[PDB]
Amino acid sequence: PSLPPEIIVISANMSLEDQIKIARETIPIAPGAQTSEELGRLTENLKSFADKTFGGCWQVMVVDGSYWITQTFVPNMSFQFELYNRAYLFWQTSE
Amino acid sequence: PSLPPEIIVISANMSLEDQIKIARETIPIAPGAQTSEELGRLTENLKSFADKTFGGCWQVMVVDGSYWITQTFVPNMSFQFELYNRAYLFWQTSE
């Protein structure tokens, strides 16, 4: 057990186990979605996936493009990975 | 007064007054930067601007592209605007 090659990690504060099961849930339903409500309830079923599995309130952000974040202290789990040149940002916002 | 026409507001939890001074500081130095060594430390002198002016720790994310966030309760000031088709996201992470 390791992360699929399809998934390219940008950043993680997280166990591989939790990265992997984010992997498994994401890769099948993610590439189907292309314009805006495709993605709108995609993020939402990803958020709703995390809250069920990992606990707390989660924020899921999807990006088509390139980005730059200041670095600051970020308290909860965060996972950032590219799947087929589309970025996925996960933040647990509560426990 | 009002916001310059260049700035297209995506979301705000903020006074116009505080939105405007983000406009003021951003528009001159933001469009100049294209490289990652530019933008990487652009976000940073934007963050470092907000922390001095508005207080607390801020997270500034710049995007070249299109994006989708889940909707959730977001506690502090947040401003999101497009300037010359490059989006700028501000989050105060503490006060």
Residue numbers in the entry:
A (entry chain C), B (entry chain A): 83 to 177
How does the study describe this entry?
Tegumental protein of 20.8 kDa from Clonorchis sinensis elicits IgA immune responses in the host and does not cause an IgG response. For this reason, we named the 20.8-kDa tegumental protein from Clonorchis sinensis as CsTAL3. The interesting thing is that similar results were reported for SmTAL2 and FhCaBP2, 40. Both proteins belong to the TAL protein family of the class of fluke proteins that consist of a calmodulin like domain (or N-terminal domain) and a DLC-like domain (or C-terminal domain) as in CsTAL3. In this work, we determined 2.6 Å crystal structure of the DLC-like domain (amino acid [aa] positions 83–177) and 1.3 Å crystal structure of the calmodulin like domain (aa positions 1–81) of CsTAL3.
At first, we tried crystalizing full-length CsTAL3 (aa 1–184), but the crystal structure contained only the DLC-like domain (aa 83–177). The monomeric structure of the DLC-like domain consists of four anti-parallel β-strands that are packed with each other and an extended loop protruding from β-sheets; the other face of the β-sheets is packed with two α-helices. Despite low sequence identity, the DLC-like domain of CsTAL3 shows structural similarities with the DLC-like domain of FhCaBP2 and 8-kDa human dynein light chain (LC8) with root mean square (r.m.s.) deviation 0.79 and 2.65 Å when 69 Cα and 49 Cα atoms are aligned in Pymol41, respectively. The dimeric interface information calculated by PISA42 is that the dimeric interface area is on average ~1044 Å2 (17.4%) at the total solvent-accessible area of 6033 Å2, and the solvation free energy gain upon formation of the interaction is on average −15.2 kcal/mol. The five residues (G147 to T152) of each protomer in the extended loop interact with five residues (V′142 to D′146) of the neighboring protomer in the β2-strand via a pair of hydrogen bonds. Side chains of these strands also contribute to the hydrophobic interaction. Nonetheless, despite the conservation of the structural characteristics, the amino acid sequences of the dimeric interface are not conserved relative to the other DLC families. The DLC-like domain of CsTAL3 also contains a hydrophobic groove. The superimposition of LC8 with the peptide and DLC-like domain shows a similar conformation. This result suggests that CsTAL3 may interact with its binding partner proteins in a similar manner.
